[PDB]
Write an enzyme that holds these catalytic residues in place. Sequence first.
Site, mmCIF file in Angstrom:
data_model
loop_
_atom_site.group_PDB
_atom_site.id
_atom_site.type_symbol
_atom_site.label_atom_id
_atom_site.label_comp_id
_atom_site.label_asym_id
_atom_site.label_seq_id
_atom_site.Cartn_x
_atom_site.Cartn_y
_atom_site.Cartn_z
ATOM 1 N N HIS A 11 0.831 -1.194 0.000
ATOM 2 C CA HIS A 11 0.000 0.000 0.000
ATOM 3 C C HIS A 11 0.865 1.243 0.000
ATOM 4 O O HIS A 11 2.056 1.200 0.300
ATOM 5 C CB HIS A 11 -0.947 0.046 1.200
ATOM 6 C CG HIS A 11 -0.271 0.338 2.501
ATOM 7 N ND1 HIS A 11 -0.826 1.155 3.463
ATOM 8 C CD2 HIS A 11 0.912 -0.087 3.003
ATOM 9 C CE1 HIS A 11 -0.015 1.216 4.504
ATOM 10 N NE2 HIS A 11 1.050 0.476 4.245
ATOM 11 N N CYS A 65 3.731 5.457 5.545
ATOM 12 C CA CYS A 65 3.848 4.273 6.379
ATOM 13 C C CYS A 65 5.295 3.785 6.387
ATOM 14 O O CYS A 65 5.995 3.848 5.370
ATOM 15 C CB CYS A 65 2.916 3.171 5.870
ATOM 16 S SG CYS A 65 2.950 1.659 6.846
ATOM 17 N N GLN A 83 -6.889 -2.774 10.257
ATOM 18 C CA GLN A 83 -8.082 -1.982 10.533
ATOM 19 C C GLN A 83 -9.191 -2.365 9.566
ATOM 20 O O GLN A 83 -8.939 -2.652 8.392
ATOM 21 C CB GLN A 83 -7.773 -0.491 10.401
ATOM 22 C CG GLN A 83 -6.714 0.014 11.371
ATOM 23 C CD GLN A 83 -6.280 1.443 11.072
ATOM 24 O OE1 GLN A 83 -6.971 2.179 10.373
ATOM 25 N NE2 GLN A 83 -5.134 1.839 11.614
ATOM 26 N N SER A 106 -5.668 5.776 9.919
ATOM 27 C CA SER A 106 -4.270 6.108 9.682
ATOM 28 C C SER A 106 -4.104 7.194 8.635
ATOM 29 O O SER A 106 -3.134 7.949 8.693
ATOM 30 C CB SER A 106 -3.497 4.861 9.236
ATOM 31 O OG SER A 106 -3.534 3.869 10.244
ATOM 32 N N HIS A 109 -5.204 5.470 1.761
ATOM 33 C CA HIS A 109 -4.347 4.445 1.199
ATOM 34 C C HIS A 109 -4.731 4.141 -0.236
ATOM 35 O O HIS A 109 -5.903 4.219 -0.625
ATOM 36 C CB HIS A 109 -4.432 3.090 1.939
ATOM 37 C CG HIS A 109 -4.354 3.178 3.427
ATOM 38 N ND1 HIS A 109 -3.329 2.604 4.145
ATOM 39 C CD2 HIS A 109 -5.195 3.720 4.339
ATOM 40 C CE1 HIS A 109 -3.533 2.799 5.434
ATOM 41 N NE2 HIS A 109 -4.657 3.479 5.579
#
Length: 115
Positions: A11, A65, A83, A106, A109
Amino acid sequence: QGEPARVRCSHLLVKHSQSRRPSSWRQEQITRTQEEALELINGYIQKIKSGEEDFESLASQFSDCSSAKARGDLGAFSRGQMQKPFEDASFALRTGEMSGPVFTDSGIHIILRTE
C-alpha cells in the site's frame, strides 16, 4: 465461503492532520488536510494507471507508512489483523488489483493486492 485465510498487500499511505499519528519518516508533523491527502492519492493513482510510475516505487518514495522501507509491502495478513476499512478493501481485491482511495484512521491508502 472459501475465502483465503490470508491476503498479501502493498500500500501507499498518505497521512493528514487528522490521522491517528500525524507523523511519519517523511515529516515529524504532517499538516496537510485530508482533502490535500486525497488530492495526492489521486495524483499517485493517475501516475500508476498511466504507467508513468510503478506502484512499489511510489510507495517506497512517498508512503507515510514505515512499510515504505519494504516498498509498500505489509506482508500477508488474515482477517482481524488490519483496521476494518483496510481489511475489507484488501480482501475485496482480486490478486493483482489496485484499489481506489481507502480511508482509515491512519490516513488515505492505495492498496495493491499481491497474493
